[PDB]
Amino acid sequence: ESHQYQTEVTRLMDIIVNSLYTQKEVFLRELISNAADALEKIRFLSLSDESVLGEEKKLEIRISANKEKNILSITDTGIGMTKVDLINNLGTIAKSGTSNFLEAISKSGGDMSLIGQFGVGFYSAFLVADKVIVYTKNNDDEQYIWESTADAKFTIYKDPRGATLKRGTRISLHLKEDATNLLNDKKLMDLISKYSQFIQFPIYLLHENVYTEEVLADIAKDMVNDPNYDSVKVEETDDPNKKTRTVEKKVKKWTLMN
Ligand SMILES: CO[C@H]1[C@@H](OC)C[C@H](C)[C@@H](OC)C2=CC(=O)C=C(NC(=O)/C(C)=C/C=C\[C@H](C)[C@@H](OC(N)=O)/C(C)=C/[C@@H]1C)C2=O
């Protein structure tokens, strides 16, 4: 880690948070935009040589939430990043003084609408998350992890698990108790619909599906064991004459949002 980066990013985070705490939900517009840019870079190269896709022929954005772990993930099958691209790019942020432009914008009553164009849109994740773990894999390198904290502290290292992404970037956000509503189905759907206006690539959301049916009491007990479902809720009854139960089978599935 660099001291210049820790000072700049603290400022970027401070200004972005101070300006957009009433519009916190715009971090998703930025991450979808970044994902779309990473996809266009690998899509553009595939027109010259379709061998860049390799085993990963999917060109899309995937949004999923882990309500238990309080994590929201934004994955894309884009170009991905090399250790060099990551270190060099973080180096340009540190010595650019974009925070100065933003400070001046904020003090003048301007909006944070240029954070994307400036290349600092990523730091908007700190409006809703106190830690951001980026998993990335580019054809020309190994899979790396880039962890970022709300105190401008970061770390870059090789993924022990290996190339679990094949190609692209995964952005995991450890949400603040302050912004847990972003793990909700209705909220994410509303936000994705809103922020996927000029997006050329498909966006998929992993959301809950419920399959309800009447089952004979003895079979209902066996259905709890079905591992093809995340959970199986079986009706409780104090009535010993009841030969049947209402069973709710819950499984998360991918739905195209655009
Ligand atoms: C080779 O292009 C890389 C990247 O070089 C490492 C581009 C540069 C950082 C820069 O252009 C000069 C930006 C290109 C962008 O598209 C967006 C930016 N905005 C950001 O806030 C940051 C810090 C993005 C960084 C990584 C992001 C999580 C990445 O997002 C995803 N999903 O891969 C990202 C934008 C990686 C792109 C594809 C850039 O700086």
Secondary structure class of 237 (helix, strand, coil):
coil
- Is residue 61 within 8 Å of residue 39, measured between CB atoms? yes
**For residue 71, what is the DSSP state?**
E
Instruction: Give me ligand 1 centre to Cα 4, in Å.
Output: 19
Beta strand pairing call for 203-216 and 61-66: parallel
Which residue out of 89, 93, 114, 169 has the highest number of ligand 1 atoms within 8 Å of its CB and is therefore the one to mutate?
89
Amino acid at 83: K
Domains contained in the chain, CATH given? 1-207+252-258 (3.30.565.10), 208-251 (3.30.70.2140)
Residue 148 Cα to ligand 1 midpoint, Å, equals: 15
Q: Rounded to an integer, what distance in angstroms lies between the CA atom of residue 100 and that of residue 55?
A: 43
* Nearest residue to 98 (alpha-carbon basis) of 185, 173, 12, 17: 12
CB 168 within 8 A of CB 78: yes
- Between the alpha carbon of residue 257 and those of residues 61, 72, 195, 205, 254, the distances in Å are 10, 17, 11, 7, 9
Residue 40 per-residue DSSP state: H
* Distance separating alpha carbons of residues 258 and 244, to the nearest angstrom: 41
Resolution of the experimentally solved model in angstroms: 2.8
Pocket probe for ligand 1: among 42, 63, 81, 132, the residue whose CB has the most ligand atoms within 8 Å is 81
**CA 85/CA 83 separation, integer angstroms:** 6
Q: What angle separates helix 98-107 from helix 3-20, to the nearest 10 degrees? A: 30
What DSSP string runs through 153-177? -EEEEE-TT-STTSSEEEEEEEE-G
Q: How far apart are CA 123 and CA 129, in angstroms?
A: 10
The H or E element that residue 115 is part of is helix 115-118
Residue environment code for 78-89, b if the CB has 16+ CB neighbours within 10 A, otherwise e? bbbbbbebbeee
Rounded distance, CA 163 to CA 240, Å? 54
Q: Which two tokens stand for residue 169?
A: 């970037």
